């Protein structure tokens, strides 16, 4: 596997024309472009210690029926959750791991490390505030957009729309919620070379608006926007990947409020912490299976 003769340079162009990959042989494409600093040490540590109580996506908000995903997602969550409390309790971080096990996971280590690399490269400002979503990026998007055709904002703000309202379904509520399995279809691979941007994902986010100014310019009431949102339309994706790329090239960093750092989270000796986790308001969920089992047991004692 570790014979990287094909340059990522060939792949950067490739991503615009041959899109991303066979979804069956991608492990050795995807990681080459993201850079996963794998070694023999930490994952085992993370695997040995582990779980549990915060796992609302396992029998609270979400089920997992397939053991390649259930029994297996427990490893990714366990790792990431005990790697950093951030993942254990935050929803927008929980949602990156969730699809990586669904999309990878078999591929256990990779789903995990891919999540950490993204935590470091694209989720840098995803937590920020907490329990609530990353306001800094909502604002950075609004800055990208007003630059990239301000009429939308003049109108959108005229009718009292706020960040979140028109930014969240690709950003702040996590970047996969508005797209389906096949529309963001490895968006993380499509933009993998554009991690080296502020992130490009911010222009993409801006381009999931702007793009939509035609219908967004029709919004007067928040309910109309809630429909935007909820429906979780795939839109195009492909034209957004590309328009965002052009916004990047045409939007100097001078126009960007949030600074993002050059994180190339690679170490053969260490794995880095997502050090933007509001430690004071994390690590409190619960599951308490017994909350209901005792009712069964009560009825049984009655029986």
């Amino acid at each position: 596997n570790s014979l990287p003769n094909m340059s990522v340079h060939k792949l950067r162009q490739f991503l615009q024309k041959h899109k991303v990959y066979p979804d069956k042989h991608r492990a050795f494409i995807y990681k080459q472009l993201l850079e996963l600093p794998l070694n023999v040490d930490n994952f085992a540590t993370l695997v040995q210690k582990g779980l549990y109580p915060s796992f609302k996506d396992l029998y609270r908000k979400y089920p997992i029926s397939d053991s390649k995903l259930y029994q297996k997602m427990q490893t990714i969550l366990s790792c990431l959750a005990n790697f950093c409390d951030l993942f254990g309790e935050s929803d927008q971080f929980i949602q990156i791991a969730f699809p990586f096990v669904k999309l990878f996971g078999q591929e256990e280590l990779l789903a995990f490390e891919i999540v950490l690399c993204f935590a470091h490269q694209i989720l840098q400002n995803y937590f920020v505030d907490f329990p609530h979503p990353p306001l800094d990026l909502l604002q950075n998007i609004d800055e990208i957009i007003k630059y990239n055709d301000p009429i939308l904002h003049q109108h959108l703000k005229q009718h009292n729309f706020k960040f979140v309202d028109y930014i969240w379904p690709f950003l702040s509520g996590f970047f996969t919620s508005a797209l389906d399995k096949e529309s963001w279809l490895q968006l993380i691979d499509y933009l993998i070379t554009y991690n080296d941007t502020p992130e490009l994902f911010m222009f993409i986010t801006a381009a999931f608006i702007i793009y939509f100014k035609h219908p967004l310019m029709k919004l007067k009431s928040k309910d109309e926007l809630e429909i935007f949102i909820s429906r979780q339309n795939p839109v195009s994706v492909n034209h957004i990947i590309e328009s965002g790329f052009s916004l990047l090239k045409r939007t100097p960093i001078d126009k960007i409020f949030v600074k993002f750092s050059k994180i190339l989270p690679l170490s053969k000796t260490s794995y880095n912490q997502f050090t933007n986790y509001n430690v004071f308001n994390v690590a409190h969920q619960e599951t308490e299976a017994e909350a209901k089992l005792e009712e069964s047991k009560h009825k049984i004692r009655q029986m």
Partner: peptide
């Protein structure tokens, strides 16, 4: 109807 994406109706 709008272009690019369809309009939202209540």
């Amino acid at each position: 109807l709008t272009s690019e994406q369809y309009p939202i109706f209540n």
